[PDB]
């Protein structure tokens, strides 16, 4: 019954997810894995369905990790969906500062793909700016991809001076 739940959560079918989650005894099916190790929380957050991820958090799910260290917030920032992002941030605050296998945060992906409102949403909250495995901040990762709107809305922000402070004096690519 894991594959019907994965298909129903991956496409926002809310009534099928309510019918499958009627028996609330066993939660091993709720946080089960995939071939790529993604929970139904990850599938609902990847495509940006806010009511499904709200229902799964109300029934009780765990912020597990992908095989590549991703989280639900990493997928919601990779996609640029502000609603699911806002729901995940309104539930818990201990999920924001989180590293993948490469040291990126959600703000790194949200600045890399050029989603301005996602960067402003993670930046209105405390984002905990940190470097990469290659010592690249999110601002440099936005500048190397020529994303005009996100660096403009970082300039309009109030954290800009702090965003100016951090870089590496030794790397040739990051200056």
């Amino acid at each position: 019954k894991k594959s019907p739940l994965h298909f129903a959560a991956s496409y926002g079918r809310i009534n099928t997810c309510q019918r499958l989650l009627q028996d609330i005894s066993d939660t091993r099916l709720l946080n089960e894995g995939d071939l790529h190790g993604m929970t139904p929380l990850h599938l609902a957050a990847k495509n940006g369905h806010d009511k499904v991820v709200q229902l799964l958090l109300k029934k009780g799910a765990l912020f597990l990790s992908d095989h590549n260290g991703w989280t639900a917030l990493h997928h919601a920032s990779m996609g640029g969906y502000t609603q699911t992002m806002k729901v995940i941030l309104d539930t818990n605050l201990k999920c924001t500062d989180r590293l993948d296998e490469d040291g990126n945060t959600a703000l790194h992906f949200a600045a890399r793909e050029g989603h301005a409102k996602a960067v402003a949403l993670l930046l209105s909250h405390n984002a905990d700016i940190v470097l990469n495995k290659q010592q690249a901040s999110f601002l440099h990762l936005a500048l190397h991809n020529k994303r005009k709107e996100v660096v403009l809305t970082i300039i309009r922000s109030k954290r800009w001076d702090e965003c100016l402070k951090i870089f590496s004096h030794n790397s040739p690519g990051n200056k």
């Binding site: 594959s3 019907p4 496409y11 926002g12 079918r13 809310i14 495509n47």
Partner: peptide, 16 residues
């Protein structure tokens, strides 16, 4: 609109 179609579509005899 296409994502809305998949969200509201009825699936019988193609499940699992």
């Amino acid at each position: 609109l296409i994502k809305l179609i998949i969200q509201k579509m009825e699936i019988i005899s193609e499940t699992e």
